[PDB]
Design a protein around this ligand. Sequence first.
Ligand code: MG
Ligand code: MG
Ligand code: MG
Lengths: 442, 442, 442
Amino acid sequence: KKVFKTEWAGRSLTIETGQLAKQANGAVLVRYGDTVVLSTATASKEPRFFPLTVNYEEKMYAADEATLTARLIDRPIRPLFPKGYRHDVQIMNIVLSADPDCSPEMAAMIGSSMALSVSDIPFQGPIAGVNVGYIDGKYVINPSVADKEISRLDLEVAGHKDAVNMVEAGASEITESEMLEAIFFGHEEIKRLVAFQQEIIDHIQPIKQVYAILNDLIKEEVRRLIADEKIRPDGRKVDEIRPLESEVGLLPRAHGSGLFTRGQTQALSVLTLGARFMHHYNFPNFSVGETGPVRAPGRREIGHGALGERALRYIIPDTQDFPYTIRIVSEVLESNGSSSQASICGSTLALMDAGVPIKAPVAGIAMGLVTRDDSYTILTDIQGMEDALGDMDFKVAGTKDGITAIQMDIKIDGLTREVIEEALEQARQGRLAIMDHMLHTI
Amino acid sequence: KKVFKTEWAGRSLTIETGQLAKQANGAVLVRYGDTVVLSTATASKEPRFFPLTVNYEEKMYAADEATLTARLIDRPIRPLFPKGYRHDVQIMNIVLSADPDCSPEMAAMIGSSMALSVSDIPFQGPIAGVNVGYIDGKYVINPSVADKEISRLDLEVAGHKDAVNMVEAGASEITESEMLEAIFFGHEEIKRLVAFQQEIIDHIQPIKQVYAILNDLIKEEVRRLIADEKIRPDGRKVDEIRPLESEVGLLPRAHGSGLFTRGQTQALSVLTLGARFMHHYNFPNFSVGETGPVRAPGRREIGHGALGERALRYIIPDTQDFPYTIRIVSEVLESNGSSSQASICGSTLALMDAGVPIKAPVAGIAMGLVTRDDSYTILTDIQGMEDALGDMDFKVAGTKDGITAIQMDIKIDGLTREVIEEALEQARQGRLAIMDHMLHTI
Amino acid sequence: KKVFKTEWAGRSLTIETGQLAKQANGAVLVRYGDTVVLSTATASKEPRFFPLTVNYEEKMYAADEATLTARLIDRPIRPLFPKGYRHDVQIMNIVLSADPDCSPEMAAMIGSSMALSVSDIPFQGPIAGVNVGYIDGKYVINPSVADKEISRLDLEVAGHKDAVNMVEAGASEITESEMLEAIFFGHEEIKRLVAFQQEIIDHIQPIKQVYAILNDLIKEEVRRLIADEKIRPDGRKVDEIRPLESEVGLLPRAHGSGLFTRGQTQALSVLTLGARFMHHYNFPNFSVGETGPVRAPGRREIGHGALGERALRYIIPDTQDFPYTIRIVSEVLESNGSSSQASICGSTLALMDAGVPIKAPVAGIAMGLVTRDDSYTILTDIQGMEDALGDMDFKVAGTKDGITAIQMDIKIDGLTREVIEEALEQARQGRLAIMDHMLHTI
Ligand SMILES: [Mg+2]
Ligand SMILES: [Mg+2]
Ligand SMILES: [Mg+2]
């Protein structure tokens, strides 16, 4: 994780990388004052017309428009790819925290530039954008909500080191000279922002670029290694949990937030208190390093949100002891096995971060199985491949004092009593280990 | 039609087959107390990745959630198909009547097992599910809504004769042993439910599994047999109506219901009273023995709902004599020609069932045409093939005293006055014949 | 532009062609009293099952149903196409002004007939439809909303010169003879309307029916002609605006309307006053002579509506001096570069039509560029091909006193200051010329 800081229009500008959304080609967290934006850039493995998609979304907890902002950010980026480049490139901008005086739109634009800049994609940037106002005869960079009310110009201009790349303006009937001056006043700031990004690029130094029978032979090799040689594809032992990392309080305008990472699975859960309890779960395709349609929550996202809500509902305080609504949203930023349990753990952190008087913290974990002729092997904290090539995905969440939720998917006829018993015990040990880590963080 | 009865958690469990949704591969009506669920299983004719889809819907008149339940029922079913089976299989569960103390989710799960078991699809069941509660230290099968409020466990468990295959639980922090005790307490009931299903299967004994030039010769033969030999593809006479069957009062929690069957066309219409008149029409793909997307009402269903509403609107009493809202929903469970008129007849039955003081009963029927030489033949109650290969689809509904609705689709340039007049006369005789039967039923 | 007038059920019937939607195969404006309906017919260039789609929409500003009305109009039209005809034919019906006593449905039915008749598509019409009521024992053509309340019959019947082609009725239990009399009373009016349509057809006389290297040589030829010979594909000069045409007050039940045409780009903007400011933009596929899905407004339509709203927002009077909501909807009836600007102009004419005390009229225009070596050429009022084959699409709108909106898309890395300077000045001259024309119209 690398943090780069500067100042922008009288407020702090930080760009973070290396920690969040590692399976996108490039990903960056932009903090502009209290505005926080996660920007990702992901490209298809092989080339597909150049298919570029830019998305912008302001989360409900951050406090047509988003369509206009995605079209805004697409413009200075689209023409700067090599001629003939046909890979499908998808860029996401998620406003996690929104201060209206610290333009989330412009933060997302430089986030989208930086996401691409560190990314692996041959984008010919960097670019940056600024908002220019025109107040009492003086041009201003990124005016506050108050200043924009007395501004005769609502100009957003973007470009690179060499030239202006985009002009998007509304104005109170200003002359051609007044506009022209505003534009190249804006481009002076753009050159500073592009220089700031280039410092980051210089430091980071991104590097730019019968079947079915085979599929069964790999399945048997993974299963043989596990049952016989006692070793898992990532070198783990059968009861080994992946490396754990965790933080709270990542978002200034949220009541509570928790970041929980387990191996290659990472979830950001954001809590909102209002004036009863709900938990939602979002699974972007950049979480698994892919592109594709940005659709409404599918069947799986509805399930995993309800499973998280079920595990957590039992420790939520009553209304007499906590007279507030509680909404938690879990964002899966990276996934390689049980994002849904990571969302449960992130939500517990966010509940404690927000000072919600819960009965007890809750953590979860998913168990696996490799069945063989004479015996079987329980796998603790399975990754995706062990789900795909194993025999079950057995998810258990609860407190130190017992179970609050179970959900199971198996690829065999059934689980014997001994399998279920052994899995529940390893899962009891697993959740206890995870909460020891979470209480260490909290 | 065969009815099989038992007792389940202190309430009656009935499974019916042979009457409803005969064009699905397998179909079953489950009655669990006042809960009523129709479950169908339909497979693609040819095999296609194994595409299995399970659907669950609680109808508005029965009284995220439905997604979780379809997700619930898929789990114990999916792994029990032969390895390498690639037919597209769709399972539909329609909650027609819902008593919250008599689990519609569990009723639908055994319905889906039952639908598959009698179906011809090589499903390796049967399976069954139960809900297990935990109240003052004792496990209970399918607790009532009141009992679940004092329950420390919300466990739903499914499996087959030999093993448990699915566990989905919420719990007030119960230990691993307590959960284990609940699972195999539930599985004792599952083995009883699967044994009951096997009794039904033992009795029923399901058996398990230039082009354009040709079509014109087929069309030419059906039309030739009709015009020359006066015989229709099913052997009917040109003015012969298909066998009629009808009952009332099928749903305990509905204000009125009518089941109307005409040959291979079957509609169940459900009426709801409230505190002005609407008729809706649903056409599931299993009604014609197919699979496919479950979409919102298409143009045809909207058309056929409005045509049903038109035929019926005229005999609905004034508010002074009946001060209630009336919503009727007609479910096409099978189709082979004019489901829309069957829905009209089903709706009239439901109106008389509900004790709605209608002006007069209403029946409908669809007429056809085969034009030849200069001669022609009017067909009474056309099936699908006579619509496709004939010249018109001429639908007339009304009372014994006259016409209340007409809708027509033709495949030739126009209908002469003489064709229209003779068709109207045969349809007058038709609706009178259908109505004589409906009053016999009512 | 040709206008054909007659009388229909005691109200005026006008059919207009030659002015609106010229890029559809056939397009017609029908005025039936105060009802105004635009009807278009467009066919795919090559044939694809005969795919015919009929669409019907009543605009909100004109004052299940639209689906039923579109199916209504499809029926008398569908069977009257040549056997074996496989071109995709799409008919759109847009109710721009709605008087409920002058049936928009029947206006749309004869509009769809006329659209196809003048179209080049081998539709074997014309057809027409009428509404027949039955009041105190007398049949009446197209009864008023009041008269329909005392009518025992709500019959819609359609057909051609030779026969009735469609019967759709609801009725208060009328006999077969009463229904039969109604149909052929209606067909007496149909033959008169079909004769009226036939007069127009006689008058108009419609006539009835390495790749990558090649595209790059065409692009180089357009750019070569522009930069060297100064000649544009339509023979225009680089600073020449396309011919302008403009009218105001096209819709009787709208508070204001403006029609603005610029070459092959045409927009109709409709203003509605209520008891704050919004501008929407619609882009039908017939505007460029194509067929295809009728979807919700896409990203471009959202963008172009907001850009129009942005150009206009600045001249909207304050609430203190104009206490009304203002809604404008701009319909792109024909397009060949910058419809977004056509909407702005249309909107301004409309605001003036509606007597909205705007600060100043607003006009817009789109500029292009052909870059050659170190040389370049600014293009005034670019058509679609000069956008596709040029270097920018630079849109500037404003008043006589300055700029109110700018939006730009470029196909090169950046725009030098002098290019931006040259574009703004030519665009300033452009909008002044357009506004000189618009004030002449107003
Ligand atoms: Mg897992
Ligand atoms: Mg029919
Ligand atoms: Mg343009």
